[PDB]
Design a protein around this ligand. Sequence first.
Ligand code: EO5
Lengths: 153, 925
Amino acid sequence: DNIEAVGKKLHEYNTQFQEKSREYDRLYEDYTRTSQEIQMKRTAIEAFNETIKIFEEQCQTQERYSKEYIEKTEIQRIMHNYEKLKSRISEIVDSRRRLEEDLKKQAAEYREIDKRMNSIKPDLIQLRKTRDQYLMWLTQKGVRQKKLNEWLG
Amino acid sequence: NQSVVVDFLLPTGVYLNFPVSRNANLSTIKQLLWHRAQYEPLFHMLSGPEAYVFTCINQTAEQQELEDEQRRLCDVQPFLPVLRLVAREGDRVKKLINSQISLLIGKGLHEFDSLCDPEVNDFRAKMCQFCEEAAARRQQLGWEAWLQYSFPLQLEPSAPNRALLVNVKFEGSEESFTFQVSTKDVPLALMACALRKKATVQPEDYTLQVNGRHEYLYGSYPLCQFQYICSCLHSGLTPHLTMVHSSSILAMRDESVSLWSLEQPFRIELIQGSKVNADERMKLVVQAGLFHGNEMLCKTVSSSEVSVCSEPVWKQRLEFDINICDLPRMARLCFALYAVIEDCPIAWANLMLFDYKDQLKTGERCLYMWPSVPDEKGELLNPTGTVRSNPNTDSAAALLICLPEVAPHPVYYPALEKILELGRHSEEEQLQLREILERELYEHEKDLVWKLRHEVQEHFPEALARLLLVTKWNKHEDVAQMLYLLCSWPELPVLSALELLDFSFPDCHVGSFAIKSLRKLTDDELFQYLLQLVQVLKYESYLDCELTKFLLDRALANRKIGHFLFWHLRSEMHVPSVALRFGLILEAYCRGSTHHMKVLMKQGEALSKLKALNDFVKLSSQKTPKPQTKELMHLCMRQEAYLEALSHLQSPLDPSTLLAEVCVEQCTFMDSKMKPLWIMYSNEEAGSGGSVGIIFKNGDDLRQDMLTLQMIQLMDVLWKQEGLDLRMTPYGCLPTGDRTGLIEVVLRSDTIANIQLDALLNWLKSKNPGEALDRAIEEFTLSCAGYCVATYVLGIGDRHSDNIMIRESGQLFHIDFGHFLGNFERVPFILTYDFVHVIQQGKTNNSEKFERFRGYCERAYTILRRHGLLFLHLFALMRAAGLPELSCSKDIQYLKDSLALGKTEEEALKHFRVKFNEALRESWK
Ligand SMILES: Cc1ccn2nc([C@H](C)Nc3ncnc4[nH]cc(-c5cc(O)cc(NS(C)(=O)=O)c5)c34)n(-c3ccccc3)c(=O)c12
């Protein structure tokens, strides 16, 4: 209630605000970074869809182009070549599946970052206001700008 | 490692998998393919290799026919190393362009299709046709016209009669002709003499090029108004030019219910939330309110408290204190989701109540919400924020609402027809309005202006902005009256139009009036405001708008404007809130700019290699010391794919500069925090500027640095416009990407920190020996004045020896503008004793010189003050950019005070002197 006592509390409350701000700022970096990574993942998954579409048009062609042809030992080479094709698709399916699993895991991280932000906001906003209420109180009491400066930070 | 196993799908259904080198270009890979395919089945059925084209899925997730087979596989950068042979035939001119566009703008065009949005598709249809037509028109027209499009004149302001020599040559010819001309000779007159000397050892078939640059000398202007000549005169150096024939330029050129009946209060149904991440002890509220620009149309109604959970259900009608007939065209519903006890803004979203075809929206909408940032304002809602949904539709929170069915037939906002129909019908007072206008208005004052709104149009045409705000936009009768006046309002000057582009004025009709008044802009002037205009696009409601068209009209008429339009838009494509808007403008731009695409393509890959080059250097700085890191940089640069990509491009900082041959030896990096790169080019044909440099900085944001430089360049132009050259160094600075840009190097320069190891004064002596030194001191004095005033007005702090920099010419300049507008209180005006010492030529007292310098500072400050409203307006629009130190009215307030606009001219100029003088006092201690 004395000026030095309120000014001390203004120092503490300012330090708590600047640090709380620093925390939120770090989380907001993670929020943004995670948002860029997930967009990247969702479009790399599109890239997996589009590749696999290309491999299944190939399979379609292999059947239509082979059936009409194959009435005329070449058979064994064609069919094994097709089996080798079909085999590669399964690698590309498996790899797509792995990414989907990362994107699911990173979606849960995004989810959690945003939750951790939303429980800091009340503290952060309450500390801004308190800091400001002590500032105005002292400005009213006549406390000189030099003294207010040295309490802040 | 070097080689990579690539999957090849042949069109017979056959499949090959063999290793090839990441270096190998596609043509080479076909040969290896054909050589291996011959020992697989069905080879006899394949046509020749040239009958087919490789196809891949690129990094943007789209198919791409790989027509240029001189490209290395590492450059093509397919998603998975998978190549399909398909047939050449098709409109593959459209296929090629569409592909390059997706790679170029960052976003894949399919992402626009995916949205299944009429507005997007309509925008794309209209804008792409419009741009394509412009481009096809350009091709037909004269080569003069084309030269004007492609290399518009770079003139000195005021846009003096001595005479000095000039070297001219011809294209494909060793020999050249030195001869005398004057400052005041027009350029065609010059062509006459070299063309006469040709017949010794037809005037309009040629123009003049500046050797080793795409800068051209033509038109009705005298020599000294051109930048190159003006620059050459001041340095004393001889010009160097080439005559070039029309042919050579041509070769370049080639390669029904009326809305006002529904008197029913506005209401919406709140259904569900989605993907909410809130504190489980708290309980959720949704606050909602209608807005038109800044202003609440009605009292903001609120929800009940449902328990905090991921998928909260409300099922609540929220009725509003406004009937559906009273809603204006740009009415904007705004939501904020809060967490409350028994304090926390979670997230927000805004919604245009009418759509792009003027239709009042009906039925369910799922608004994917944006997270709320805690800040000084901390308002209930965020009505300034974008109206587009969050593109992270997978993981972002959301709100399902329903706009009810209001009438059986659909309903549109009334046509301009019936606005004039409604708006037609309706010295004691003049003294009060004079007082109110000629000098955020008050209840009292607002009511007067509205009564005398016709007198405002008649006698106070500049006070349109004041009147728009005083209109009650929550009553349709008023809105009709104001718009009626607006349609017959006289054209306002540029300065006023810029104010009208601010968020405060969202009505489509106001924006149209603004752009209408900006059409008188010259390209040179438009360029000074391009950054601001671009940021104002973030305030727009719909995609198709007068501003987007305006910017596209100018980009298509002028290739330099097109260039910076491109990079301004491109450098924000990482930002979710503008990716879509900007993406669509960039596509439209490209389609009308196929020539420039080729240039912009090359630049983006220089930029892409530099990113990778910086990431290597950064990651190596941790491991090794600098000299070895400097050489491990050089090896990575000397790789063929890098070197080709970093060499022979037009500079993004100035497209007339050719970065030709990279000088790997002279390249390096500074060991600061972001570890920026210093890249040196030696381009042929240029002389004293036959070396040029660029800095590639990655990890910091460069926008505030650019804004600041843009503003200093503007001052220099305003000063140069009244005969004061203060010898500034408005060096280039361009954001190109996500926390990435380029900065133009200023050679023959050092930092005061280094120079101080008569300290400044000796350095200049050793750089300007003998009778040169006088110039260096005058160069120093003129520039000290300019940067003293500039930095005082912009309120730039954190100045020191490490960020003030001196040229061997004498010119002083500042770098690295981290903070401005008095951000870490009023920044005093500042004189260093060091700079007072140099200005006084080393004397304790040199009264005569020092007064000239005080005059320069006073002339400076006075001129800017004449254009003070320009800086407020340009700064007010920059709030759109979301720079933390330019967020509100107080940041703008700084400028009013710094230029003392509230004071009279002589009053202000007395305060400058007292500020000036105490800086002279304070300089000793
Ligand atoms: C290797 C390397 C990488 C980066 N730098 N930067 C510098 C100095 C600080 N800056 C410049 N030097 C010359 N010409 C210039 N043109 C524009 C700038 C400019 C403008 C800015 O706003 C910010 C920054 N710096 S940054 C990119 O943020 O690091 C630079 C600039 N010097 C340097 C040059 C001469 C003497 C001592 C130091 C480097 O050697 C250097």
